[PDB]
């Protein structure tokens, strides 16, 4: 058996991602 | 996704071709007073002076 | 999707508000109609933005919903639920609505505990299975003994009847559905009863036509009544016959040929006309219009004949008359002809009808359908259409079940002594099937305005211990026995609630994104 | 017609004439009486001991949670010259008695009501209007007959928190049912006036702070200020004070007029600077001369003065409000001293312990005064859970003295619980048909209007009106008449005389008298001339 | 109300949508801070559209609350109630506005089930007087044996900061917040602990200061430091005299008694340190600004001059270096000195600041913070603020709880155990009460990830039969003893959250119309 599993349907599994996408942004304009 | 900056970002040759121009726009004035055979200026100004 | 969007003008929603706006949508349904589930429910009126905004009012969930005009894509998947049960059986509409909301509402319940959707439909799906074992091991059979099936039919006519308009006139429309299908014998058509809605008078005043009721009156020059007339029904043409030649002109030297062959053209009408006669008949129905020339030549021969009763309308004589379709005529032994006693006119609403009273082989009737007002008129006979579907489905399988909510508690006594069986991740979900079932008996109490409280726990309490036929008493607001009060419902409309509930539910379920597109003709 | 006379010309009477609305008929009167339905609508939802609150959102967004009807018909937005009334008629009686601000006006709208039938039989409205009065003596004779009460404002005084509770139990409070009861009772007899029956209602502050629970509400007997002593080393603590009640700050004395100084020569210019440090020193001697230890001061402070202070070991405090050092003043039985010459010892005030109370995480340092000697004003000190319940305690702990000022005027009480309303009811009817000359449907009506007040109680109370109605009605004339009410919980029987339920004999003479003269004042009206739009 | 509205611009709803938008504003605001309900829930990002965007990153319920702006004007009403929560204890402001939110959203449920309002309203305070003697009988107390009492201090201050930026520095932390306290001696000010926030270096680089700091730097022309300093601390004025008589002019012949009056002012400015200075003293921090003038006659005196380092700067250092404010100087032997080891300034963060190193009768203390980012150091000084003040009221009031979900499950229990000998009618509504009490470790292990199906059930069994310890272990996932694991919480932080939760909620309960006034200014 799996032994459970956690449903987690919601706006934190976009933001956590967007955060990255917008720092790197920046982070390559002085590369 | 882009740079979130709310202006333009111009990289590259895009300003380093533009940095000549600006240059050579203004050179294109001096080079014909050059020597005792170049030609006088007028300048006139917005309320005619 | 809302970070770097590359549509054009559409848009999507996912895992967010998809399922929020879904079950948003498509759970108000239920309560909708709500408030028409049992015999003390409310009526409603829907009404049109204008011209001509045709008022209706209604109590069938069917004639709700159809006209509400829903937009929201998910909410659209109920309303078309409620369509095909109209069209299976005619009724418990309300009931298959309420169900498939209430299973929606725990559904969103079961989301918030974290249960995966997939989890939800599988619990359901042996639910479901629990549920429709018990509705076969209840049903209740008629064959033989005439004398207790017709029983059957008073009953069914009766709790059908109970939650429409008709409800203190039922001494008077039971007998109006359930003899009006006995009368039949025959394929259940549901055109075969036909209503004719008039103004004047009371419910209480409507009446069975033992026979069949024409429009277009008795001619100009014709008999207006022959006793132990013969009648002759046909589907041919009176004038303008044009005999199939296309493209065909009358070219000649002068006009006297066009005289003479004028005359020829009256003479062929002239010829047509006796060929018909020579039939023997009394009585003749066209659907085609007559025209002056035959009417004089019909009322020279002491014979009448209607014009265009209807489209269908010689189709129908047909079945209660006897006869044939007799579109050309040109072996008059070959033609059956039908048999009546008066074909006298009768004065019904200040209308002057054609009766054809004492047909032989009379499989058809019309009801006159009396009212005071016109929103009367519209709705009751809506009530007559709906208990002769049952009726005309009833008299082809006569298993029935116990109604009064004492169905839906088996059910849930099912799912629940099975759900116990099964580990928790599944049964949570199985017991959640149950307590939907439950809620319709709670639904139809608290819309009377009883205790439901008491009503529910009673009921459950009864039923886990035998009592497999006590179910609501709506009149005094305790539990009974349905056996003695003669509470019963089709077998086949309890059915397809059941199924039909479970089977559009798992739409919404299954479903986490919705994209839309872009609209047109909008500015 | 206006605007075009007959010779085609324009027809102008008045300014605008076609931006006026004039309609008299029977349609003003039915006008008035149907808007009044809309007014009565609102404040039936919230009568009896389930009445349901009102959230009422300011102008401003500010949002408060009510029961007081006071609270409810003061925020509306209602452009009803009669409707404005309807109002009028709660603050009437608001101000009179302080109790009835939902009863009025639904007994108001049920005249209101019952006249609609009236004026449909023909009856002129200006009889239906006398015929009111005819039945309204009746009722208030009738509601003189049956009172009786033991208080006597000394010892005895379990029928007086007796009505505190019935008064409390309608508000949001009842969990202090019994504790606010007590307080209101020991608030009012220790500042009352039993000589006059007069009580003077600035003799009991009320003041709160955000934070705690209810049944932290307490008592004081003293004053409560904001306490900020000019020295932030000062003691906080002083057992037996003596208190200084100055209104001159501690600074040089300077004239009022027009003054400007000339100074000549250096010693001019230092001469002033040794006079005006002496200034500084008598100043503070001139305190310690009378025994005092605790200085309160109107005004503020020299950084000079703060030094004299610590070292003189004299606290004070600084910027006491006008009210402030009034109150405190006369509950120290002390005297305002206007300068700092005029200090004598026998205008010191004489108190107790003295504290500030700091509170959570905060820094408001709020005065408690232990020990008081004949004090005539006391300070109640409200505490909540958060802003709303707070300001409803203020209104919940107001009617509650005011319903004992009420009984300290006058003593006489009769039976709640809707026993005099329908007694009345059945007295009226009695003597509707002693003579039916022309008024017999005015009096009738009058009767059926009484009874309004029972049935909203029933429905708010989750009873049929007419099986409660029936049954009470019935009891009370197969029997010599008892003080038979009705109750949601029933609490065995409805008998008042065991549930203690009492109400005041002038709350509601008041209500039945006022009533009436508002409902007269807007029937006898057939033209209403309200302008539209400017242009 | 709706018909015949005699309104001018304002409006108002009774009975329909009064109540509903009530439950929804109130239940928003719950689902909003629900993800910051336990050790491992999220942080937010608050930021305005623009002018001064003031971005802050946020745990705590109630500093989030107060930043958004609700509009919604039955939706302020928790609002006001995690205000009043942050004020009086500092922490639990989630948790009084999870539990309230959940206790309506039962309530929701109750009055659809057609139970009267104030029905509901009597279960709760029922249920709340049971959970009320709960946390009563369960106190721990602790009087001496201090050695004891610091153990619990520890684990106090840890349980506090795991919900907050602070989560792996326990280490530093943790006795930073114990100790600063521990070191008032007195009453629990929250004054006398000052927090100073330096960029640069970690967090685990802070350290607590033995000593006290102050801004503006050493003078002119004066040491730079001083060993066994005697301070002297001042709040009067150096220059401008304008001695008290307002409304003098100087009004002279010539030009010579102008010289001499200014001759006379510096001869006042000359006495007036000669005063100063027969205190004896080594340092003169005055709250007022100190002009040129004083600043040599001080330096000619070896004596520091500190001006207006802070308004309540002389507050402060009276009871850090065991002086007095002195406001005026004119009788040395009636003032008291203070004394220190060092004044050095010291360089921190690229800052210079004086330290007072080695102060006598030190009854206060600085944190130096240091962090790598502003919003680090901005939530990290929270942090700090939260701890101490939870420690400044746990040294007053001794008595403590264990947590957990350990006070919740014997409240919850507590509920159930007396709701089961009450009627039906309200015995369905103490069930719901206790179901909120339930919801809350629920929450907790849902943030976390834990299957909080099993986990609650596994502490309902634990809790059925003595375990009155049993409690939800976030490190391991399982239940375990609160008592060994050293997972506690102070008395006074959970009865706040009790009582206040239900107060709140039924004031939203009782209201059945809101009335809406016109607005102003908005066109």
Redesign the interface.
Same mark, same amino acid.
């Given at each position: 058996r799996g032994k459970?599993?956690?449903?987690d349907?919601?706006?934190? +599994?976009?933001i956590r991602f967007?955060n990255i996408? +917008?720092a790197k +942004?920046?982070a390559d +304009?002085i590369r | 996704?882009?740079?979130?900056v709310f202006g333009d970002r111009s990289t590259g040759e895009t300003i380093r071709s533009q940095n000549v121009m600006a240059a050579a726009s203004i050179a294109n004035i001096v080079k014909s007073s050059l020597g005792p055979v170049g030609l006088d200026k007028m300048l006139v100004d917005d309320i005619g002076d | =999707?809302?970070?770097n969007i590359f549509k054009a003008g559409a848009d999507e929603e996912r =895992?967010?508000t998809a399922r929020l706006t879904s079950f948003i949508g498509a759970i108000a349904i239920g309560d909708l109609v709500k408030s028409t589930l049992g015999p003390k429910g409310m009526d409603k009126i829907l009404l049109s933005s204008g011209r001509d905004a045709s008022l209706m009012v209604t109590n069938d969930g069917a004639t709700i919903l159809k006209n509400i005009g829903v937009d929201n894509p998910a909410a659209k998947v109920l309303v078309d639920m409620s369509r095909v049960q109209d069209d299976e059986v005619g009724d418990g509409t309300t009931s298959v609505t309420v169900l498939a909301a209430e299973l929606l509402r725990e559904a969103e319940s079961l989301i918030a505990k974290?249960?995966?959707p997939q989890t939800i439909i599988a619990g359901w799906r042996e639910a479901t299975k629990a549920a429709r074992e018990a509705l076969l091991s209840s049903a209740v059979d008629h064959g033989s003994d005439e004398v207790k099936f017709r029983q059957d039919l008073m009953n069914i006519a009766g709790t059908t009847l109970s939650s429409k308009l008709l409800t203190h006139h039922k001494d008077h429309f039971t007998k109006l559905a359930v003899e009006a299908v006995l009368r039949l014998k025959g394929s259940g058509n549901l055109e075969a009863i036909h209503i004719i809605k008039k103004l004047g008078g009371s419910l209480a005043d409507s009446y069975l036509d033992e026979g069949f009721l024409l429009d277009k009156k008795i001619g100009v020059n014709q008999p207006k009544r022959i006793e132990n007339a013969k009648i002759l029904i046909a589907n041919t043409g009176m004038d303008t016959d044009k005999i199939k030649i296309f493209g065909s002109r009358v070219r000649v030297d002068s006009t006297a040929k066009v005289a003479e062959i004028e005359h020829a053209e009256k003479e062929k009408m002239k010829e047509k006309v006796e060929r018909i006669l020579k039939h023997g008949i009394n009585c003749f129905i066209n659907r085609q219009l007559i025209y002056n020339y035959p009417e004089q030549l019909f009322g020279a021969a002491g014979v009448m004949a209607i014009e265009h009763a209807d489209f269908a309308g010689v189709e129908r004589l047909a079945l209660v008359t006897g006869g044939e379709i007799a579109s050309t005529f040109d072996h008059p032994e070959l033609v059956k002809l039908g048999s009546c006693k008066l074909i006298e006119e009768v004065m019904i609403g200040e209308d002057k009808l054609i009766h054809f009273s004492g047909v032989a082989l009379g499989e058809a009737c019309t009801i006159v359908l009396r009212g005071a007002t016109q929103q009367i008129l519209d709705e009751a006979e809506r009530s007559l259409h709906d208990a002769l579907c049952v009726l005309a489905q009833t008299v082809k399988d006569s298993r029935t079940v116990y109604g009064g909510g004492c169905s839906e508690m088996l059910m849930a006594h099912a799912v629940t002594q099975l759900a116990n069986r099964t580990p928790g991740k599944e049964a949570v979900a199985m017991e959640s099937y149950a307590k939907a079932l439950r809620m319709l008996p709670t639904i139809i109490a608290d819309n009377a305005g009883y205790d439901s409280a008491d009503l529910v726990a009673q009921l459950r309490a009864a039923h886990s211990e035998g009592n497999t036929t006590a179910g609501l008493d709506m009149r005094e607001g305790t539990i009974g026995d349905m056996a003695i009060l003669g509470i019963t419902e089709s077998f086949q409309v309890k059915r397809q609630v059941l199924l039909s509930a479970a089977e559009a539910a798992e739409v919404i379920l299954r479903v986490?994104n919705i994209i839309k597109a872009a609209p047109r003709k909008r500015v | 017609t206006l605007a075009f006379d007959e010779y085609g010309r324009p027809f102008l009477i008045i300014k605008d004439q076609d931006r006026k609305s004039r309609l008299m008929g029977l349609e003003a009167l039915k006008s008035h009486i149907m808007a009044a339905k809309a007014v009565a609508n609102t404040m039936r939802t919230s009568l009896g001991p389930n009445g349901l609150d009102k959230m009422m959102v300011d102008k401003d967004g500010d949002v408060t949670v009510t029961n007081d009807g006071a609270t409810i018909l003061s925020m509306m937005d209602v452009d009803h010259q009669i409707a404005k009334l309807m109002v009028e008629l709660s603050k009437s009686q608001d101000d009179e008695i302080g109790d009835g601000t939902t009863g009025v006006v639904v007994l108001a709208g049920a005249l209101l009501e019952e006249a609609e039938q009236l004026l449909d039989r023909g009856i002129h409205p200006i009889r239906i209007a006398d015929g009111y009065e005819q039945a309204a003596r009746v009722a208030i004779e009738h509601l003189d007959k049956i009172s009786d009460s033991v208080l006597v404002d000394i010892k005895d005084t379990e029928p007086l928190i007796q009505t505190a509770k019935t008064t409390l139990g309608s508000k949001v409070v009842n969990s202090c049912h019994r504790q606010m009861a007590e307080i209101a009772v020991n608030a009012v007899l220790t500042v009352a006036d039993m000589e006059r029956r007069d009580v003077d209602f600035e003799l009991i502050k009320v003041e709160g702070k955000v934070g705690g629970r209810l049944e932290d509400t307490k008592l004081i007997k003293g004053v409560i200020v904001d306490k900020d002593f000019s020295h932030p080393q000062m003691p906080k603590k002083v057992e037996d004070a003596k208190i200084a009640i100055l209104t001159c700050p501690f600074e040089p004395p300077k004239p009022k007029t027009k003054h400007k100084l000339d100074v000549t020569s250096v010693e001019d210019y230092k001469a002033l600077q040794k006079y005006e440090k002496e200034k500084f020193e008598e100043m503070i001697q001139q305190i310690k001369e009378t025994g005092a230890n605790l200085a309160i001061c109107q005004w503020g402070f020299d950084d000079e003065a703060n030094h004299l202070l610590l070292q003189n070991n004299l606290p004070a405090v600084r910027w006491v409000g006008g009210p402030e050092i009034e109150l405190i003043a006369i509950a120290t039985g002390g005297r305002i001293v206007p300068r700092f010459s005029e200090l004598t010892a026998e205008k010191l005030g004489f108190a107790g312990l003295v504290q500030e109370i700091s509170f959570g995480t905060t820094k408001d340092k709020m005065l408690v005064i232990e020990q008081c000697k004949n004090s005539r004003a006391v300070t109640i000190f409200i505490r909540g859970g958060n802003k709303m319940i707070i300001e409803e305690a203020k209104r919940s702990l107001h009617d509650a003295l005011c319903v004992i000022r009420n009984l300290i005027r006058d003593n006489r009480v009769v039976y709640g619980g809707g026993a005099a309303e329908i007694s009345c009811a059945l007295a009226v009817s009695q003597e509707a048909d002693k003579c039916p000359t022309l008024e017999q449907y005015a009096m009738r009506a009058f009767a059926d209007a009484l009874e309004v007040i029972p049935m909203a109680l029933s429905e708010n109370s989750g009873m049929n009106p007419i099986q409660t109605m029936t049954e009470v009605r019935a009891r009370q004339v197969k029997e010599m008449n008892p003080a038979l009410g009705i109750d949601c919980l029933h609490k065995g029987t409805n008998d008042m005389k065991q549930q203690h339920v009492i109400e005041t004999l002038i709350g509601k003479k008041q209500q039945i008298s006022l009533a009436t003269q508002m409902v007269r004042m807007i029937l006898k009206i057939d033209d209403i001339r309200k302008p539209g739009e400017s242009e």
């Open positions: 459970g599993a956690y449903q349907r919601d706006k934190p +599994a976009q967007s996408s +917008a +942004a920046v +304009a | 996704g882009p740079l979130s | =999707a809302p970070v =895992a967010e974290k249960i995966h986490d | -």
